[PDB]
RNA sequence: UAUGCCAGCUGGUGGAUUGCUCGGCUCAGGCGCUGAUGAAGGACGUGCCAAGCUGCGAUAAGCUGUGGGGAGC
RNA sequence: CGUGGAAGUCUGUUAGAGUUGGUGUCCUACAAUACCCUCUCGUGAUCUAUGUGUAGGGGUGAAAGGCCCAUCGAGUCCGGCA
RNA sequence: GUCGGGUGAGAACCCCGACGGCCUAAUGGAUAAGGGUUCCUCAGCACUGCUGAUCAGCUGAGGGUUAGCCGGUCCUAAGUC
RNA sequence: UAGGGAAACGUGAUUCAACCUGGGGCCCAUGAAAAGACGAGCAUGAUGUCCGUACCGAGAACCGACACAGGUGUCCAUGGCGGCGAAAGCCAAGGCCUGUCGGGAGCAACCAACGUUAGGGAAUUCGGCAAGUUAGUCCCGUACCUUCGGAAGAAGGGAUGCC
RNA sequence: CUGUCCCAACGUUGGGCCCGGUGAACUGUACAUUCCAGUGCGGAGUCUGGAGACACCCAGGGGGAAGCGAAGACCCUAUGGA
């Protein structure tokens, strides 16, 4: 008894993979008489032809590792593979840092803290990279 | 890459096709000229005296 | 002069269109258009054709799937012939 | 490869040339198809 | 009917990546020799097949506890894991 | 006497030989142009069942007329 | 010090292209030029598909007398031809 | 691959389940060229299949390719007639 | 109050292919054309013929005489962990057990791939052929020479997990 | 740095060996169980003389058949070719 045709029809009607269809080992003769697509549909509702479930890669261990790396752990010098400029991009780090300092000095000019001349002094120096972070910018504004 | 068996892989071109005039697979569809009857080159039919031994 | 309708295509799928969808299948002459197949079917069976779908079979002949209107029934036409 | 109308008419006939000599011709001649073509072993036109 | 421990230490002769296949041949041979029947007569229940193919095809167990029966006209046996 | 050697015997394998000839080869006489009124050639069709060939052309192994012929096809 | 992001630049079995050594495997082959490890290039004079052009004493040739359908110090077929 | 089981005159290799593996730019998906019916069903094992075959791209006979809006068709390119 | 779903038939977020739109730089290289569309409305009705449409698309549907370990273009380059990575390794979705003959012998010699070999360490050989050693990332450090570009990852030294 | 060597050992997988099935080819003047000498166109399983030699079969590594494979590319010759 060849049920390979029905296996092709079962996988289209259940819209699932060919390797996932299950045929009841006890109902072979009744699956053998299954000529049409409707014959296959009826045999699905009878429970004789079912579909197995698709597996998923259990992210359980991954999530518990995402926790520790976000806290600063496991990123030791024996777990780094790519070079430094590969782990964090230099041009992208500047974009992050400099906009952060250009978002600061803007909020200071439009508040009255800094004057048009004091803002210019710092913007050109920020663009010149005289300040490391926003914290070093503040440690310069305050005398 | 050797000129033999592996160069035979790049052979998926159609050149000689069934002619309209004579019917031999000799119509070069890229040249629009027949190599058997000469359709597309001559108004006459391609016949040659060397297609038979001199005194025949 | 060539005739349009040659003979009816009477296969199992030609019944699945006759019963369910009210369509008559004919194997017509390959020089015929959808509009020529249409007029021809009407002038031979006293029916009203709405749509004609053609295909050039692997037998060199042209298969014409002719859809009738609600007023005419395909199962009733295939009876007399 | 895209076939044309004529190319189709031709490949169509070549398929009917692939039919066996009917059972009755054997009984009429009182006892071979020579244009026996296979889709793999043989080569057609075009 | 009795319970026999089948040693599979002769499966280490057949190449590692096939160890499970030979293990199954050994069981069938061991039972036919002890219950006095033919190799064709011995029917193994899929339990023995899953027990032997547990850790892949190459890391098959060294022994196996097995429960077998003995009956019928020609003479045959049905066998399973304990 | 196992493996085996030479000759024969029955039976194969093989298709020579002999017999036969729907084909060839050569000679001789007769005859001798076709095509835009679309030839020659080709393709695709054409049969109750039709694959090859022959014929034929959508009127498709055939339609008309005159003569021959004749109970068959 | 930074910003910038150049290159017949760099590492790279990324796709891809090439083919140094093993003078390994094979050598009535898987194959009338193959297998495997190694090795080279990999933003450029780069690699590739399809279309198209150049024809035999002629093309094409970063030139090896290389390539022009397993045919090249003058392609192939048929004829001259016995 | 293995143990069960199915069909069968006949089963290591046809089919069901289970257990066990292989493939991750491909051994998955869609296609161009080229192939030309090789697609589908039924019936088969003289042929073909690196063994066997109840299977098959094999053999035999049916069935199958439906578009105003997907290609073609139109345009022009190197270039060709 | 289409559809689909056994059911629920979500809401927010980051990084964002495609797709949209800008800024910049290079050339002794300057990066197609044409048909068509836009310019330039709306209603109702009609018409829209013809050709392709099956399947393969490859370790069996193509080319290589073969069900050939060869050759042959395109799109999927964002499936999960991984890690710089379209890298390795493992795993989905999906496909397969047809790179299609099997059974048996602790299974010898001998051969192909290959692992580990004490002490010595190139004595082997034409020649370190073969195999091997080093190896990613971080920090310290880096000679001669140099066309000032480079040499240079010179060399050398330290570090490297888990909680 | 190391099995390249001194110097070889054990192991691993696919073969190899036995059983089923499938099922080619290279080569064949004839005879042919050889060996030691000799002789011969001076490089003999086959001639002469001796020696040896019961037949068949399995596995083997290849000493011999001036082994198989290719009308020597070297060399000379031809009133040869390019
Ligand atoms: Cl298309
Ligand atoms: Cl900008
Ligand atoms: Mg069947
Ligand atoms: Mg920078
Ligand atoms: Mg159409
Ligand atoms: Mg057919
Ligand atoms: Mg080396
Ligand atoms: Mg080109
Ligand atoms: Mg030279
Ligand atoms: Mg389909
Ligand atoms: Mg195969
Ligand atoms: Mg040692
Ligand atoms: Mg020495
Ligand atoms: Mg010379
Ligand atoms: Mg000369
Ligand atoms: Na073919
Ligand atoms: Na005449
Ligand atoms: Na005229
Ligand atoms: Na006929
Ligand atoms: Na600078
Ligand atoms: Na190589
Ligand atoms: Na020439
Ligand atoms: Na098989
Ligand atoms: Na990822
Ligand atoms: Na070793
Ligand atoms: Na020898
Ligand atoms: Sr190659
Ligand atoms: Sr090509
Ligand atoms: Sr011309
Ligand atoms: Sr002439
Ligand atoms: Sr048909
Ligand atoms: Sr072929
Ligand atoms: Sr470069
Ligand atoms: Sr590189
Ligand atoms: Sr060499
Ligand atoms: Sr070779
Ligand atoms: Sr090697
Ligand atoms: Sr790059
Ligand atoms: Sr000649
Ligand atoms: Sr049989
Ligand atoms: Sr099939
Ligand atoms: Sr963005
Ligand atoms: Sr399709
Ligand atoms: Sr495909
Ligand atoms: Sr391939
Ligand atoms: Sr899977
Ligand atoms: Sr097979
Ligand atoms: Sr050890
Ligand atoms: Sr040395
Ligand atoms: Sr030395
Ligand atoms: Sr170091
Ligand atoms: Sr031998």
Residue-number span of the structural domain to which E22 is assigned = 1-82
B25 contacts in chain D (CB < 8 Å)? 45-46
Distance from CA of C23 to the nearest CA of D (A): 26
Residue B20 CA, ligand 23 centroid: distance in Å: 48
CATH number of the domain that residue E79 is part of: 3.10.440.10
Backbone phi and psi for residue B36, each to the nearest 5 degrees, phi listed first: -100, -55
Which nucleotides of chain F are near protein (any atom < 7 Å from a CB)?
Answer: 40-45, 49-52, 58-59
Residues A71 and A99 grouped into a single domain: no
Task: Kindly state whether residues A23 and A67 are assigned to the same domain.
Answer: no
Q: DSSP letter string over B8-48?
A: GGG-----EE--SSS-SS-EETTTTEESSS-TTT-SS----
Query: Phi, psi at residue A35, to the nearest 5°?
Result: -90, -60
Interface test with C, best of D9, D15, D44 (most C CBs within 10 A): D9
Please check whether residue E19 is in contact with residue E62, taking contact to mean a CB–CB distance below 8 angstroms. Answer: no
Q: Which CATH number belongs to the domain containing residue A143 in this structure?
A: 1.10.1200.60
Contact partners, residue D14, CB within 8 Å, separation at least 6: D37, D44
The structure tokens listed for E5 are 């421990």
Which nucleotide is closest to the Cα of B53 by its C1'? G79
What residues flank ion ligand 29 with Cβ within 5 A? B 41
Tokens (6 digits) for C16: 């699945």
Closest chain D residue to B15, measured at CA: D46
To the nearest whole angstrom, how far is the Cα of B8 from the nearest Cα of chain D? 16
Instruction: Note every long-range contact of D8-11, with CB atoms under 8 Å and residues 24 or more positions apart, other chains counting.
Output: D8/C56, D8/C58, D8/C60, D9/C60, D10/B18, D10/D45, D10/D46, D11/C58, D11/D44
Å from the C76 CA to the H67 C1'? 29
Domain with A138 in it: 89-143
Domains of chain C in start order, with CATH, are 1-81 (3.30.70.330)
Q: How many domains does chain A have?
A: 3
Tell me which nucleotides of strand I come within 7 A of a protein CB.
48-53, 61-68, 70-72, 79-85, 87, 91-96, 103-107, 136-139, 159-163
d(CA A87, CA A66): 16
Domain identity same for A49 and A60: no
CA B12–ligand 21 middle distance (angstroms): 28
CA angle A60, A61, A62 (to 5 degrees): 90
Give the pairing type, strands E2-5 and E42-44.
unpaired
CATH of domain D1-46: 1.10.1620.10
The SS3 call for residue A51 is strand
Q: Considering only CA atoms, which of A104, A127, A106 is closest in space to residue A116?
A: A106
What subunits make at least 3 CB pairs under 8 angstroms with D? B, C
List chain D domain ranges.
1-46
The whole-angstrom separation of Cα A57 and Cα A61 is 10
Q: How many domains does chain E have?
A: 1
PDB experimental method: X-ray
Q: What CATH number should be reported for the domain holding residue A28?
A: 1.10.1650.10
* Alpha carbons within 13 A on the beta-carbon side of B11: 7
**Residues 6 or more apart from A61 whose CB is under 8 A from it?**
none
**Domains of chain B from N-terminus onward:** 1-56 (2.20.25.30)
């Amino acid at each position: 008894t060849d049920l390979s045709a029905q296996k092709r029809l079962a996988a289209d009607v259940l819209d699932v993979g060919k390797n996932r269809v299950w045929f009841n080992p006890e109902r072979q003769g009744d699956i053998a008489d299954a000529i049409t697509r409707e014959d296959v549909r009826e045999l699905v509702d009878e429970g004789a032809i079912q579909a197995k479930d698709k597996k998923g890669n259990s992210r359980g261990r991954a999530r518990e590792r995402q926790k520790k790396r976000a806290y600063g752990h496991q990123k030791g010098a024996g777990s780094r593979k790519g070079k430094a400029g590969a782990r964090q991009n230099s041009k992208e780090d500047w974009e992050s840092r400099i906009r952060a300092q250009r978002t600061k000095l803007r909020e200071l000019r439009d508040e009255g803290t800094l004057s048009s001349s004091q803002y210019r002094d710092l913007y050109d120096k920020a663009g010149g990279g005289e300040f490391d972070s926003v914290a070093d910018l503040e440690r310069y504004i305050d005398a | 890459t050797g000129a033999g068996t592996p160069s035979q892989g790049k052979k998926n071109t159609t050149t000689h096709t069934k002619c309209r005039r004579c019917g031999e697979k000799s119509y070069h569809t890229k040249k629009k000229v027949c190599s058997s009857c000469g359709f597309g080159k001559s108004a006459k039919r391609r016949d040659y005296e060397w297609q038979s031994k001199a005194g025949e | 002069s060539w005739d349009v309708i040659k003979h009816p295509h009477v296969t199992e799928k030609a019944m699945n269109d006759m019963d369910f969808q009210n369509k008559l299948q004919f194997a017509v002459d390959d020089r015929a258009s959808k509009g020529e197949v249409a007029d021809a079917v009407e002038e031979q069976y006293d029916v009203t054709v709405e749509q004609v779908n053609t295909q050039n079979t692997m037998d060199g002949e042209k298969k014409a799937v002719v859809r009738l209107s609600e007023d005419d029934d395909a199962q009733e036409v295939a009876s007399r012939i | 490869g895209k076939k044309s109308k004529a190319t189709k008419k031709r490949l169509a006939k070549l398929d009917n040339q692939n039919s066996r000599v009917p059972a009755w011709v054997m009984l009429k001649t009182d006892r071979r198809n020579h244009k026996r073509r296979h889709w793999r072993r043989n080569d057609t036109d075009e | 009917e009795r319970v026999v421990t089948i040693p599979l230490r002769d499966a280490r002769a057949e190449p590692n990546h096939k160890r499970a296949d030979k293990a199954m041949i050994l069981i069938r041979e061991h039972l036919a020799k002890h219950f006095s029947v033919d190799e064709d007569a011995v029917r193994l229940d899929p339990s023995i097949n899953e027990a032997a193919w547990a850790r892949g095809r190459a890391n098959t167990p060294s022994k196996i506890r097995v429960r077998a029966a003995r009956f019928e006209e020609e003479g045959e046996a049905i066998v399973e894991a304990e």
